[PDB]
Design a protein around this ligand. Sequence first.
Ligand SMILES: Nc1ncnc2c1ncn2[C@@H]1O[C@H](COP(=O)(O)OP(=O)(O)O)[C@@H](O)[C@H]1O
Ligand SMILES: Nc1ncnc2c1ncn2[C@@H]1O[C@H](COP(=O)(O)OP(=O)(O)O)[C@@H](O)[C@H]1O
Ligand SMILES: Nc1ncnc2c1ncn2[C@@H]1O[C@H](COP(=O)(O)OP(=O)(O)O)[C@@H](O)[C@H]1O
Ligand SMILES: [Mg+2]
Ligand SMILES: [Mg+2]
Ligand SMILES: [Mg+2]
Lengths: 189, 524, 525, 529
Amino acid sequence: KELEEEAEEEQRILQQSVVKTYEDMTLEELEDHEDEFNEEDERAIEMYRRRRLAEWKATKLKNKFGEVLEISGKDYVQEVTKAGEGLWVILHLYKQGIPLCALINQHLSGLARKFPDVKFIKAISTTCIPNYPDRNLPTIFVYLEGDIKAQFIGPLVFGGMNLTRDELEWKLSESGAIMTDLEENPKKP
Amino acid sequence: PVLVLSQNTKRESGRKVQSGNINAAKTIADIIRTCLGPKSMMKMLLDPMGGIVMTNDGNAILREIQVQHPAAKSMIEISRTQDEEVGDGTTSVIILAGEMLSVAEHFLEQQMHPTVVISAYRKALDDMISTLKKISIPVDISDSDMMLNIINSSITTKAISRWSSLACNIALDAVKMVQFEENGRKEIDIKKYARVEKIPGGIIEDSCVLRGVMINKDVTHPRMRRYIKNPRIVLLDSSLEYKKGESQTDIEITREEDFTRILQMEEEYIQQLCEDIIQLKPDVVITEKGISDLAQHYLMRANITAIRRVRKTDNNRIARACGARIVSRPEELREDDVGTGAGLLEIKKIGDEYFTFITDCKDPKACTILLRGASKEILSEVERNLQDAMQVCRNVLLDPQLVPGGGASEMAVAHALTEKSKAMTGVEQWPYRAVAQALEVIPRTLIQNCGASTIRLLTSLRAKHTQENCETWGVNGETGTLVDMKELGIWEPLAVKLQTYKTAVETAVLLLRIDDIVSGHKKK
Amino acid sequence: AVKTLNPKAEVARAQAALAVNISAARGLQDVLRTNLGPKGTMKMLVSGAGDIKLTKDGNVLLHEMQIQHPTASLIAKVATAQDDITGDGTTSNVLIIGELLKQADLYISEGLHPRIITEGFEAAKEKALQFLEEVKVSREMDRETLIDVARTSLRTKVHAELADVLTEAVVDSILAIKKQDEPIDLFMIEIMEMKHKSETDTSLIRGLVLDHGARHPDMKKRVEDAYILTCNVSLEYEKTEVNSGFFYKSAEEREKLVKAERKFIEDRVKKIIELKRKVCGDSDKGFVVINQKGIDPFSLDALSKEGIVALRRAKRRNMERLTLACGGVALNSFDDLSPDCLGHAGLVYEYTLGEEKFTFIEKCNNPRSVTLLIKGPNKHTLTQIKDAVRDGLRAVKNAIDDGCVVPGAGAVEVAMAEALIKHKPSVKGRAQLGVQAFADALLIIPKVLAQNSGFDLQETLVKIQAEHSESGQLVGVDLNTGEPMVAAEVGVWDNYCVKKQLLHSCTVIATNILLVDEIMRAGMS
Amino acid sequence: ALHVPKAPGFAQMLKEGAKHFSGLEEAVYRNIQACKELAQTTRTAYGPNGMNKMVINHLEKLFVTNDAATILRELEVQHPAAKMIVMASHMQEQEVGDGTNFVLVFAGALLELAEELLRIGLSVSEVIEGYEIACRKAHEILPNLVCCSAKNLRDIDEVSSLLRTSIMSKQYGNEVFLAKLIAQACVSIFPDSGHFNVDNIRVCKILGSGISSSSVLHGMVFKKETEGDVTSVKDAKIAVYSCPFDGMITETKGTVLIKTAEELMNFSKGEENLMDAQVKAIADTGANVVVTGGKVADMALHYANKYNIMLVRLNSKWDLRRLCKTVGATALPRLTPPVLEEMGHCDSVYLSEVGDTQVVVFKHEKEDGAISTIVLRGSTDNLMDDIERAVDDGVNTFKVLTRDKRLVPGGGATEIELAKQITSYGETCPGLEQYAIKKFAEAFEAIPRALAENSGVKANEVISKLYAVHQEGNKNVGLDIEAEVPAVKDMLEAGILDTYLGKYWAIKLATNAAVTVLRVDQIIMAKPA
Ligand SMILES: Nc1ncnc2c1ncn2[C@@H]1O[C@H](COP(=O)(O)OP(=O)(O)O)[C@@H](O)[C@H]1O
Ligand SMILES: Nc1ncnc2c1ncn2[C@@H]1O[C@H](COP(=O)(O)OP(=O)(O)O)[C@@H](O)[C@H]1O
Ligand SMILES: Nc1ncnc2c1ncn2[C@@H]1O[C@H](COP(=O)(O)OP(=O)(O)O)[C@@H](O)[C@H]1O
Ligand SMILES: [Mg+2]
Ligand SMILES: [Mg+2]
Ligand SMILES: [Mg+2]
């Protein structure tokens, strides 16, 4: 693992992409290295630290949701339209059909936990939309503010049972949602 | 349209490709033919990343060369193999392989199947190993004079030869300071515990191996003493500040006296950890992770010098030197884990950097080479030569045998197996003698490099090298003359020579068994 | 022969490699030789953005040259290593490399091998080392000799009046050193920049200058008799590490919880207030708090209501510099506040410059760390003065370290070249001719001094060896007249370690270049 | 033989876009030419007859003005030597506030004369040392040229007269009015302790009527509107807050817990009652105006209207601190109704409309205060910008007049007298350097000639008249403006003067810039990106 010397570490950091160029870290590794940074530019690194701290506190101020809240047709108008300025929702319309509702329900809890920044709401099709066809068993109709932003209706759109944990992140984010910490379009396979 | 194989697949077959393979090896043997001998010539290599490598050894030349011909790729892999296994004889093995293929091509043309050539090559390899073991002489390990002579023989053909009388000593010291006895058996000699570090600028002979460890760190706090006479060093792996943990805690506060109580709990935890460290009375604490402000304050109140994050290899060599032991949980920091024996700890300033020395320690098992020179490339070449000398010293301490140098042993084994082949009969005798005169290139290479005429000199050498136990007679490449290597006094470990011969013959077999090439397709 | 294996490969063979290396070294030498000595000419350098850099240093100019040649980079990093360790002697380094290479190629093009040339170079280096060891003068490093050495260096870097004022400032700065056996630490003498009044206003401040100021408007802007409390504790709101969270049921609970969350830092600041009031609130004796970590405006106001001045977000080095200058002790926690933890200052005040604020601390009893305040009308002047004072400081520290100093103006080079010529009959081989080259190589040092002054190289040089006759002193070149001038009497000095480093590194790099018979570029694809 | 190859050495190892200029004729002459071009692009904007110039910046913003520093900053310059002169002029503007056009003209003249000398056959070092000697001589003789030192700096008429001559260089027509307003603003801030600040004179720009409608008020004007419903408090006690007018919350995240219906009933009522109690506590102290640095809650706004509290929001820390200075209050981080010593006292606060710009006014009616504000009217944004530049220059003139109150005659008198003295010194000096000294007399001729050049008269004629008169010894005579014929008149009586410190710094910086640019003889430009 870390049984590698200075030359080996330089070789690895050069081979990975190019270099970390002492400008692209979070509050963790720029804080832990803490000694490779040369001392003639303390003001620049401290200004960067203060701006990143401001960014972190701003992000934590708007991270207040944490988990999905499920609603009925009564308040559906308010959480589909009056959810807030600069916030978009998920609106997973689900039933007790086992496969796709079950998988998506288990995955959305994890996504909401790891994204406390975006609203997750799930509703049952019977009492949210009058006489929904119910053949298109999944339904995540993403609303940007109150308008259409994306739509996933068919199990073929997701791909059926073969759904992993985090490719849903990319599927939601491709429409313009919060950025991803993951690469590759269809999460490899 | 209609295809069987891929569109991009190309195929080559027949003697054509065989010739190509041989030629490829010769080309690889042609780049670094002038780098062999005490009169070698430096070569400059331009890295794709902007660096420059100014070197002599063959491996450092080939590792910077990319070849799309797969036979040359095999030759480069052979060079890396010889560099890693023994650390010496790269140019010798590459030249030997090149000339063995070059002489096997002649038999390939004369409608001879490669299999008989391979069999003769293997027989020649076995016989040359036998007769190379025959002419060997023992070496006295306890004798330091002969050790210095062997390292001089290994270093006379590099750029630091002018400082050989220094450099050899350095290598010897390091190799005789890492020598360790493991649990019961398993004597070891590892270069992970022999670090060479380059500090540009200064004087080359100012370089020396320190009786201890040097790292490029600084004291955590200004008030902590930068000069410790007899340190008691404790080595830490974990961190000395407060960390969240692993599970999700999410402490809930409803009272007025829980927030400040939480913060005071963090402070008291740091205080308790530092008091656990302090109670056993250390003097220097080395940690691989960060140090909290409270941590260094509490350590300082007990007059302890704290060195912040240190790479794990440096901590391992520090532990091996001082005799200490790394502990992650401070509450289990035992008395036996405290490092006593470090003769002096000094935070010196070199150029515009702070360097910490734990030198003067008793009977260390790890060393650091203060290698001071003039430039980064000069120091890189110096440390490469030091690594070669270290590898040769380890080879001769693990093998008490020696063999004459300057192409004397090669000519001796060539003549021995030539006289062996003169009695047998068959079709395999011709490749046998082909290998016999194939081992002859390196003396010829030395004579060519020194600037003398190879024809008459090598003819005289071969003629005189036939009678009256003259197997130690070789060429002096400084004066380009024929000398008896006993008076000249250049000897090489038997391991290096036998490994060179084995690797050359095996590379010849590998590139001679091949007759078809299919190029261009998906990985799998 | 790698073009057979790598079609897109660049190869320079033996004669080609020698020719390209000598040509590159000659180009570098010809560019760099127009600035050596105080008679050199400045160079203006413009980067991509458009910033202007006026320089005369060998290392600075060599880095900012737009060059791509490999051997040029080799000698560039040789020069920057020599600058890093010794302090100066970079342009002369490049000139010496160029001259060794030129003479070696002159003697090789006549049908010769470089091996004997390098052997002669090694023998000449040994003899030159012996002569340099035997020619240095050892004295007691006092005020006058240090003024002489620093004046030489700064007169090289800048013009007369500014060089002299900088020399006085540099010596007075690096003369407040600790115990004689204790090696000098140059971090304490820190450099501060001010785009300010004329360049002759740069000076030495006994205390410190800090780029930060009092962040609270109501804090006093000048305190006469100041206690100093240097710290590393955070009066900033430090939240609970493990993801805490408040839970209440009414607005009254919310108010109680905000008071409770402030209580911790309030207590920490109250410790400082108690220490100040216990030490001295009397006779307008001010209190200054200098903290490395941030301070929250609540604590700013709390300290300000007590008539305190507090400095937040200071550099790591400044705590050490202050505990060495003011005389207190650094603090990482307030567990044990004692009156002995406060340093003493005779004047702490604040000066404005546009929008920036600087805090000056001075009138210390006996400073151990001083500061150099550089004042200039434009940025390139500040950078030039900074490099000049760096060179001067390293030169003075080098002179102090070993009590020996060599005569300058190229006198030592001429004398040691004469010694090499005398020793030449005793090399016992062809290598002696290489020794000759080495000798002539050293003559590139005095010759350029003539060339830069407007005098002919040959006549003034032959005058120098004429003056090095039976009247055998250490006589160099006079840049005002050209007549030979005794260096020691006038006082043009030079650092012995610089000459030693030149004689070592130049020979090593020239020998390694002369042994290069092939420049290779492959392995890219 | 159809292609000249690159010279081996440096010229063959250069980079693609790098340009290496070496030698006197290839670098020094080009630098001199570029600096002369930079000087002549602004020479026409010198003096009380300098025409305004319009510049379109890289963002397509119109700047019409004759202030040399502004047109020099908002005009992209790529030459190195011209950048040197730009830096020198900007440093002069920062140090004094005037002389930037003087620095441009003097540096250009020095470099042109240095090029002439170098053509004649003088060396670079000879010219540099002669320039330094002449500059030291000029600095040595400058104090003897002063006359009519500033006396009071408190009387309105005297300070207005002193600033009028620094104002005429821009807006030559409306001169007395601007000087009167600048003097009125400046005297009210002079804190009779000697430390006069220039950041306490603010300018408020209101579109509408002509310049003659401008005014000064001993308070401030904010382009804002009160968030409450009460306006125009008569004699208010102002409370200043640095925190939002809201119930302060925990920095750590806090979610309320309700486990019984009683708490859910009482939560909103208790929060409302707490806010009402806080607002009543603030109001009962006699406070009439509350100003906050953040957002204002709707409930807090309600309780502000209920108790008749004016509520003015502010969205700038600088504005907050300046309001604190002008009213005498201090910002406090909590609500905590202020104690008696930190309640700002102002004679009135208004919400007024003058040019369809609803503004909030904190006017004092006793001339007392540490901050005064110029509300200047105009018909165009650019014209008000030029007037604001003139006000800044006048304020900086007053600031440099607080210290070193000495004055020197203007209108070319001081420059010509200094040139005469320096050429007498040069003629009374031996050596090869004397030539350079004799060039300063010509360099100081560049300044008055430019004035004549902008007045439509003959520069040679006025220069000849200036020397002819100054030979007698009346060192206080200079160029006359608007006489339809090159003539001269006294400057001590005419009130046309300049600060001694300003001319001192201008001469020093111009000589420094010229010497520094002359010193370099090799340029290596590197691939303009
Ligand atoms: N003074 C000498 N005279 C003649 N031959 C020598 C001398 N020194 C070393 N040699 C021979 O040269 C070889 C060393 O070449 P070297 O560059 O070490 O090859 P490699 O790079 O493959 O290790 C050894 O085989 C040794 O026999
Ligand atoms: N006043 C002087 N008179 C004559 N020679 C001098 C004088 N001052 C310095 N020198 C010589 O000129 C040389 C200047 O070298 P320098 O430009 O500092 O080299 P580098 O730029 O490599 O540090 C020194 O070797 C010194 O001996
Ligand atoms: N009424 C006047 N008559 C003659 N000359 C004047 C009059 N008013 C100003 N001047 C001169 O015009 C010049 C204006 O220069 P100015 O544009 O202010 O230079 P800068 O822009 O560098 O401050 C001053 O040197 C002053 O001596
Ligand atoms: Mg070897
Ligand atoms: Mg120097
Ligand atoms: Mg003006």
